[PDB]
């Protein structure tokens, strides 16, 4: 019934033959048959399906209260699958104006070359979202909170816009995780995750997922999962599943630690602006409160003294690790403007060069606050 | 210098810090910075275990560049998307691997890519299939499951003449038996799931090239679409590769013995094996392959039912999909299938493993009756 | 500084060459040298030492505030090492009268055959512990709380007895974990863990550990770690480290869930007695409150209707899994009964309370009890 | 029936539920039961037994034509288990005078402290072996060929001496491997392997094994495997099984390559002596030919110019890697007198300081000979 329970129990039952309590790691590419096309348990070739991946898919679906789940080699592979399943040449996608850089790069640098068009919009403005919808729009791509500004989109509101124009709605739920936000309950057709981030939780397995309740959509995804073959290995699928068992517990601590870090930085003279969905003054706070169970582990801040101060903070932390990625037990810090591609100018919001992004981990909060205090001098 | 040596030694050098003789499994998605350490920033983009695997793959094909992927089909998908756009055309085999045909015909046609299937053995027919829009010729040799042979150097010349790239799917032969880049191909593809890994335990793919711009086009899609291998799997793939030369030699010896046994057996009408002088394309095979491989396909005298029953009755050959394993595998391909040749329903495909040959021949003799 | 912080950060620092944030899995049995004996990083042969095991040993030591750590293939292999390092033929060990059955088996069925003698004692009675000490006693083996009765031993008090008689004191800290109890700070010479249980946390890696501040004792352990070779593989050592990263967080929720389960069962008429260190009426509660930061995830109960009711409860739960072992995220349940040691009552059920939603756990027990 | 076939097929049968062709990696420490004691497949707790270890144990036993197999965390843990199973205080073991250094160190430095005694003997001299047997001798420890000197022992002859005096006979078959030598067929009671070496074959898993036909001895080993817990992880057990699949093929090439290296070195003026069981002049060559199917991958040589020449050869090779261990696909080289412990003096033969040990791998032979030629100057 509860999400912590499902994350542990759903989608692998102890094996009948051995009782093994955990899904085994099936490092087999192929599966013996009886008589010919007499499949055992439906298994025939690992890319097509294998038992470890099935277990992960069932756990993933369960924690989003979805009927169907599909696992991929990365978040980007899941995104690529979703785009290729739902779009064809001549179709259009509405996307966020501050999307995840990787998603933006895949759509702008790859899919435009295959005659897909897009329009970026401020997803917080429902009138703008609707206005960006054309007769060719087949998909609205929602991410909330966004990476790195933590902007908020009203999922139920956007889902209505999609229903009214026969466009599917996909929510990239990576930052919130299943633990904090359930987009299918709010009207989304499909949820995407990079399981590399909070679901795995340990910065040790790259992976993606798509979940849906629409059986025909799940079939379209399966055709590309099999056909194009961006599929996870079984050791990685096991590590993803293992991480997922502690997601609920970890997200609670992440949120608590992040709230403390946001309050500390909000009081600190080196900081001009704190971006955290739980702050009453954060734009979209009331939307976040309505659709999220907690406000997450991500905090971004803008430095009063500019790009140099941002770079200095990133350089001087000793517990926050200066590295890309997010959603790990270990705190991570980065300066996102350093990752700017020239090409995004005009099509995506400029990430301010005074901004630092903090992925607040589950270390003792006093040590995290002390690290930031010393780093800031 | 020798290929067995390179498989073992090229690519990963024992580590400076520890001397570990094998490439470590870096189960890390991200890398602390100072600039980067070692050039690593985020594992999808690059990581040390995949770098090692890519360097070993490139070394065994005498290629400057290698890219590793989550499967053979992901490597194919990367190749098609890097080299084609809407409005372009690809010449393909008339008896291509079913997964490659399915991807091109069921997915890429929907993105305004066109194709023409051709008997690759007929160079005049290959040339005639080339249009002004043809940007790629897709070569597989020997083909899966009919073991037909394509003249790589002759097709390479056709590509050069019409400014079309030539890709060779070298899965069946492997780098130990065939080196398409030395024959003019622009890119080589492998399903490393098969002979490179060798043990039916890791799904993986690879693209290797000498063309730096083309490797960059591949990298853009490896990173951007993210069909990338995990580090335990890249380790297993590398591990397998260390015995490829030695395994392919025994595969080939065992296959030859199987082909001769089955040639002499009355239950069998036709034997398809590149090493038989009567096999169509044998002379081409002999010129471009160091050995004739581990795969043998046969046609049963008594038809489909005799094919089905042979597959059911072996006790050492395992009835399963896939190929290129230490363990012998057997399948009835027609049960897995105007745009491609019809695989005869009396055909059985044997992936002959490295078991003792006398046990394999005994297993076939009892199963055939 | 804080324990959750050290669990994540002490031990492995991101690699200088690559910055990898996690300790790599070094699946190498050997290491290239620069000239004969020019070692790289000290590494020469995996059984003797390897980078993934080093990383795990540093993490394990850090979380016990210990100078030295050693990792083994299982908890029992750590135990075997400790016994072999600290005893010889003719020596004696004082042991708990309700020790972990594996430990008792190893000592009674193997080490007695090698002319080591033992005396079982109620560790809660310090006079009895002291009286059990002979001139040949070299080791006092403490476990607290015990498996499965959750009896408590005063570590500091036994430490004093060990000091007074030149006997070393080992504490098996598996049930409490480093997150709840720090025996080296109370005077123990050595701490043992089965990392199979809470430290790994996910019922997916078998492993053991010894930690100490005594460099000489660590050397004696190292000699047998290398020489008898009961050493973990690197995938397993990585899984153990990964688990450790969430230990503090998990033990908090284990303790909360367990307290709720104990209260529920204490109120239920099918239950005669509840064994949980956190109950004020539990024998040894005050000692537990002094030496433990929290009361753990284990609960044992005695059934009013006896052995058959204990069997039935174990069979009828759908969230608690009927299986051996303990200290996993997933709740586990078992019927332990199924002159040298206390007899475990055949009406007793042992619950390893996991981290699932507490309302689901209480509902599972309610339905199973009928 | 043939050994290559058994190595691939014996032990693990493709799974009934899924048909997986390979033994799955069961990363579970525990197994669900049906009602209390209703075990599934006999599994209860992983240290006691687990499906991946079972599969390995079955494969190991099959390749030695043995009824019983037991897998350990290392060769040394297998040795420890054998000694503890078969000896008690007051008992005695006859050992080689030139044993593997690890085996000797365990017996001399650990077991002597537990009141076990030993006598080292030239195993090639059956009279001497017999004379070393006392009323308290419970075990004769045979290693052939020995590490590093490649001396040969007559297994059948020594088995007879053990039968005559009711002492068990153990053969450490690590260097020959099951592909080249089958000691149970020659009368041994137990065979030990470090599977770290040729069976794994890839210098990537540490492991050990004991195999026997005596059910009571296998029970005594199980008691200590379970009780003292020196047991392999499932990943490592899987890698050991994977390596075993190619053992027969590898050992053939190792033997071919080694013979070529021994011939090259025998003709080279910098080399005084070549130690290889296949040379007709090697002491014990006729015994080796009688009991071994091939002469193995190890070659040791003595350098005419002494210790410094031995050190130089080891430092100057670029294909042979200067590292410990042996039995890998990659060639390895070492100077064993640097690895020996001084306190063996008087109880073991001295390994001459002019000796180089070569573990000849499966690289191309021409490259291996070129490497030795350049390194020797
Ligand atoms: Na795989």
Helix H or strand E encompassing C306: none
Contact C105/D at CB under 8 A: yes
Tokens of C351: 């619950």
Q: For C33, which of B19, B22, B25 is closest by C-beta distance?
A: B19
Which single residue is written with the structure tokens 């070298």?
B170
C197 catalytic per annotation: yes
Tokens of A301: 């801040």
- What is the DSSP annotation of A293-348? SS--SEEEEEETT-HHHHHHHHHH-SSSEE-S----SS-EEE-GGGG--GGGBTTB
Q: Which are the contacts of C234, defined by CB distance < 8 A and separation ≥ 6?
A: B25, C25, C26, C27, C50, C52, C53
From the list A374, A355, A241, A366, the residue with the least C-alpha distance to A298 is A355
- The 3-state DSSP class for residue C80 equals helix
- The 3-state DSSP class for residue B339 equals coil
CB C299 within 8 A of CB C263: no
Between CA C126 and CA A195 the distance in angstroms is: 53
Name the strands in the sheet holding D332-334, side by side, starting at the edge strand that comes first in the sequence.
D271-275, D298-303, D355-359, D332-334, D321-322
Between CA A37 and CA A34 the distance in angstroms is: 7
Query: Minimal Cα–Cα distance from A371 to chain B, Å?
Result: 17
Between CA A253 and CA D232 the distance in angstroms is: 35
Name the strands in the sheet holding C137-143, side by side, starting at the edge strand that comes first in the sequence.
C68-72, C208-212, C190-194, C168-172, C137-143, C92-96, C117-121
How is residue C212 annotated by DSSP?
Answer: E
- The 3-state DSSP class for residue D140 equals strand
User: Considering only CB atoms, which chain B residues are within 8 Å of C41?
Assistant: 17-19
- What is the DSSP annotation of C319-341? SSEE-S---SSS-EEE-TT---S
Burial level of B5, CB count in 10 A (0-12/13-18/19+)? Answer: buried
Altogether, the residues listed in chain D come to a count of: 377
Query: Minimal Cα–Cα distance from C57 to chain A, Å?
Result: 19
Contact B30 A239 (CB under 8 A): no
- The 3-state DSSP class for residue D14 equals coil
CB B149 within 8 A of CB B284: yes
How far apart, in Å, are the Cα atoms of A140 and each of A79, A109, A221, D178?
Answer: 13, 18, 17, 63
Between CA B18 and CA C235 the distance in angstroms is: 18
Tokens of A241: 């599943």
Between CA A356 and CA D333 the distance in angstroms is: 52
Burial level of A24, CB count in 10 A (0-12/13-18/19+)? Answer: buried
Between CA D299 and CA D255 the distance in angstroms is: 10
Task: Give the phi and the psi of residue B138 in degrees, each rounded to 5.
Answer: -100, 105
Between CA A242 and CA B48 the distance in angstroms is: 24
* Ligand 1 midpoint to CA D15 (Å): 18
Between CA D82 and CA D230 the distance in angstroms is: 12
Chain B, residues 234-263, CB within 8 A of chain D, namely 239, 242-243, 246-247, 250
D47 catalytic per annotation: yes
- What is the DSSP annotation of D252-316? HHHHHHHHHHHHHHHT-TTEEEEE-TTSTTSTTHHHHHHH-SS--SEEEEEETT-HHHHHHHHHH
Query: Which of the other chains make 3 or more beta carbon contacts under 8 angstroms with chain C?
Result: A, B, D
- The 3-state DSSP class for residue B50 equals helix
Contact A18/C at CB under 8 A: no
CB B285 within 8 A of CB B327: no
Q: Is D278 left (phi over 0), alpha (psi -120 to 50) or beta?
A: alpha
Between CA D330 and CA A88 the distance in angstroms is: 50
Between CA B169 and CA B185 the distance in angstroms is: 10
Question: Which segments of A192-306 does DSSP mark as H helices, in order?
Answer: 215-228, 234-244, 247-266, 285-291
Between CA D76 and CA D223 the distance in angstroms is: 17
How far apart, in Å, are the Cα atoms of A363 and each of A372, B173, B224, C267, D72?
Answer: 13, 53, 32, 37, 37
- The 3-state DSSP class for residue D121 equals strand
* Ligand 1 midpoint to CA B322 (Å): 13
- CATH 3.55.40.20 at B245-369, yes or no: no
Contact B24 C25 (CB under 8 A): yes
Query: Minimal Cα–Cα distance from A140 to chain B, Å?
Result: 19
CB C268 within 8 A of CB C199: no
- The 3-state DSSP class for residue A371 equals helix
CA B251 to chain centre: 15
* Ligand 1 midpoint to CA C279 (Å): 50
- The 3-state DSSP class for residue B344 equals coil
Contact C27 B32 (CB under 8 A): no
Between CA C357 and CA A1 the distance in angstroms is: 8
CB A356 within 8 A of CB A250: no
Which single residue is written with the structure tokens 């200067």?
D322
Contact C51 B235 (CB under 8 A): no
From the list B72, B97, B62, B77, the residue with the least C-alpha distance to B175 is B62
Which single residue is written with the structure tokens 């955290």?
A276
From the list A5, A245, A195, the residue with the least C-alpha distance to C202 is A245
How is residue B290 annotated by DSSP?
Answer: S
Between CA B3 and CA B59 the distance in angstroms is: 8
**In this structure, are strands A168-172 and A117-121 parallel, antiparallel, or unpaired?**
unpaired
From the list A95, A77, A87, A16, the residue with the least C-alpha distance to A232 is A77
Q: Is C11 left (phi over 0), alpha (psi -120 to 50) or beta?
A: left
From the list D74, B232, B12, the residue with the least C-alpha distance to C27 is B232
Tokens of D93: 């073991």
Which single residue is written with the structure tokens 């077991």?
D111
Elucidation method:
X-ray
CATH for D248-377?
A: 3.90.1150.10
- The 3-state DSSP class for residue D142 equals strand
CB D123 within 8 A of CB D158: yes
CA B222 to chain centre: 19
Contact B42/A at CB under 8 A: yes
Half-sphere exposure of D69 (CA within 13 A, CB side): 23
User: Helix, strand, coil: what percent of chain D each, to 5?
Assistant: 40, 20, 45
Query: Minimal Cα–Cα distance from A189 to chain B, Å?
Result: 22
Tokens of B209: 């090239």
Between CA B315 and CA D8 the distance in angstroms is: 13
Contacts 24+ apart (CB under 8 A), C366-370: C366/C264, C367/C316, C367/C318, C368/C312, C368/C313, C368/C316, C368/C317, C368/C318, C368/C320, C369/C268, C369/C270, C369/C313, C370/C316
From the list D309, D329, D308, the residue with the least C-alpha distance to D319 is D329
Question: Cβ atoms within 10 A of the Cβ of A34, count?
Answer: 12
Name the strands in the sheet holding D190-194, side by side, starting at the edge strand that comes first in the sequence.
D68-72, D208-212, D190-194, D168-172, D137-143, D92-96, D117-121
Contact C29/D at CB under 8 A: yes
Tokens of A329: 């037990």
Helix H or strand E encompassing D85: helix D75-86
Name the strands in the sheet holding B329-331, side by side, starting at the edge strand that comes first in the sequence.
B268-272, B295-300, B347-351, B329-331, B318-319
Paired strand residues for A139: A93, A168
Which single residue is written with the structure tokens 């059956």?
D126
Paired strand residues for C332: C321, C352
Contact D18 A43 (CB under 8 A): yes
How is residue D120 annotated by DSSP?
Answer: E
Q: For A40, which of D16, D27, D235 is closest by C-beta distance?
A: D16
* Ligand 1 midpoint to CA A339 (Å): 32
Q: How far apart are the first and last CA of chain D?
A: 48
Task: Give the phi and the psi of residue A107 in degrees, each rounded to 5.
Answer: -75, -45
Virtual CA dihedral for B174, B178, B184, B190, nearest 10 degrees? -10
The CATH number of A1-247, from 1.10.3720.10, 3.30.720.110, 3.40.50.20, 3.40.640.10, is 3.40.640.10
Which single residue is written with the structure tokens 């899995």?
C25
CB D299 within 8 A of CB D261: yes
> Nearest residue on chain C to B231, judged by CA atoms?
C25
Q: Is C173 left (phi over 0), alpha (psi -120 to 50) or beta?
A: alpha
Helix H or strand E encompassing A123: none
- Exposure b/e, C216-233, CB count within 10 A at least 16 = b: ebbebbbbbbbbbbbbbb
> Nearest residue on chain C to D89, judged by CA atoms?
C114
Q: Where are the beta strands (DSSP E) in B273-334?
A: 295-300, 318-319, 329-331
Contact D17 A18 (CB under 8 A): no
- Residues B17, B23, B27, B32, CA torsion sign: positive
Query: Which of the other chains make 3 or more beta carbon contacts under 8 angstroms with chain B?
Result: A, C, D
Three-class SS of A53-77: HHHHHHHHHHHCCCCEEEEECCHHH
Virtual CA dihedral for A338, A344, A348, A354, nearest 10 degrees? 20
Helix H or strand E encompassing A3: helix A3-9
Q: Resolution, in Å, please? A: 1.6
Question: What is Dmax (Cα atoms) for chain D?
Answer: 74
* Ligand 1 midpoint to CA A234 (Å): 6
Burial level of A342, CB count in 10 A (0-12/13-18/19+)? Answer: exposed
Query: Which of A23, A59, A362, A365 to probe the C interface (max C CBs under 10 A)?
Result: A362
Contact B44 A84 (CB under 8 A): no
Query: Minimal Cα–Cα distance from D114 to chain C, Å?
Result: 6
Q: For C330, which of A2, A21, A328 is closest by C-beta distance?
A: A21
Q: For D33, which of A19, A29, A41 is closest by C-beta distance?
A: A19
Between CA A275 and CA B296 the distance in angstroms is: 64
How is residue C63 annotated by DSSP?
Answer: H
Contact B5 D329 (CB under 8 A): no
Between CA D178 and CA D247 the distance in angstroms is: 9
Contact A362 C8 (CB under 8 A): yes
- What is the DSSP annotation of D312-376? HHHHH-SSSEE-S----SS-EEE-GGGTS-GGGBTTBPPPPTTEEEEE--SS-HHHHHHHHHHHH
Q: For A367, which of C5, C202, C253 is closest by C-beta distance?
A: C5
CB C175 within 8 A of CB C299: no
- What is the DSSP annotation of B229-248? --HHHHHHHHHHHTTHHHHH
Give the architecture (CATH level 2) of B1-244. 3-Layer(aba) Sandwich (3.40)
User: Considering only CB atoms, which chain A residues are within 8 Å of D26?
Assistant: 18, 20, 22, 24-25
User: Considering only CB atoms, which chain C residues are within 8 Å of B27?
Assistant: 22, 24-25, 238
Three-class SS of C85-150: HHCCCCCEEEEECCCCHHHHHHHHHHHHHHCCEEEEECCCCHHHHHHCCCCCEEEEEEECCCCCCC
Query: Which of B8, B15, B39, B230 to probe the C interface (max C CBs under 10 A)?
Result: B15
Indicate the class that CATH gives domain C248-370: alpha beta
CA angle C88, C92, C93 (to 5 degrees): 110
How far apart, in Å, are the Cα atoms of B37 and each of A168, A186, D320?
Answer: 42, 43, 30
Q: Which are the contacts of B87, defined by CB distance < 8 A and separation ≥ 6?
A: B112, B113, B133
- What is the DSSP annotation of C175-207? TT-TTT--GGGGT-SEEEEETTTTTT-SS----
Domain boundaries, chain C: 1-247, 248-370
Name the strands in the sheet holding C348-352, side by side, starting at the edge strand that comes first in the sequence.
C271-275, C298-303, C348-352, C332-334, C321-322
Tokens of A87: 């779009």
Tokens of D358: 């070569």
């Amino acid at each position: 019934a509860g999400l912590a329970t499902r994350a542990i129990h759903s989608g692998y039952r102890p094996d009948p033959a051995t009782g093994a309590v955990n899904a085994p790691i099936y490092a087999s590419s192929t599966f013996a048959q009886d008589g010919v096309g007499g499949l055992r348990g439906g298994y025939e070739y690992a890319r097509t399906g294998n038992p470890t991946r099935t277990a992960l898919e069932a756990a993933l679906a369960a924690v989003e209260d979805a009927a169907f789940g599909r696992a991929f080699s990365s978040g980007m592979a899941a995104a690529d699958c979703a785009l290729r399943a739902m779009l064809r040449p001549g179709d259009h996608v509405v996307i966020p104006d501050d999307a995840y850089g990787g998603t933006f790069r895949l759509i702008d640098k790859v899919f435009t070359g295959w005659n897909v068009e897009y329009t970026p919009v401020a997803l917080a403005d429902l009138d703008a979202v609707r206005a960006a919808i054309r007769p060719t729009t087949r998909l609205i791509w929602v991410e909330t909170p966004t990476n790195p500004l933590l902007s908020i989109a009203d999922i139920a509101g956007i889902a209505q816009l999609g229903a009214d124009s026969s466009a599917k709605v996909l929510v990239d739920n990576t930052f919130a995780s299943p633990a904090l936000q359930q987009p299918l309950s709010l009207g989304a057709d499909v949820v995407l995750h990079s399981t590399t981030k909070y679901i795995g939780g340990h910065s040790d397995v790259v992976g993606g997922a798509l979940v849906t309740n629409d059986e025909e959509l799940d079939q379209s995804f399966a055709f590309l999962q099999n056909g194009a073959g961006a599929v996870p290995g079984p050791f990685d699928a096991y590590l993803t599943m293992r991480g997922l068992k502690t997601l609920v517990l970890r997200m609670q601590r992440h949120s608590e630690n992040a709230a403390a870090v946001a309050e500390f930085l909000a009081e600190h003279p080196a900081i001009s602006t704190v971006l955290y969905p739980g702050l009453p003054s954060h734009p979209g706070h009331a939307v976040a409160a309505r659709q999220m169970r907690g406000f997450g582990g991500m905090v971004s801040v803008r430095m009063r003294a500019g790009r140099t101060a941002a770079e200095q903070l990133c350089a001087k932390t000793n517990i926050f690790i200066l590295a890309e990625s997010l959603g790990s037990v270990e705190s991570l810090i980065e300066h996102p403007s350093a990752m700017t591609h020239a090409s995004t100018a005009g099509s995506q919001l400029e990430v301010p060069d005074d901004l630092v992004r903090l992925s607040v981990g589950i270390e003792d909060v006093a040590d995290l606050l002390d690290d930031l205090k010393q780093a800031l001098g």
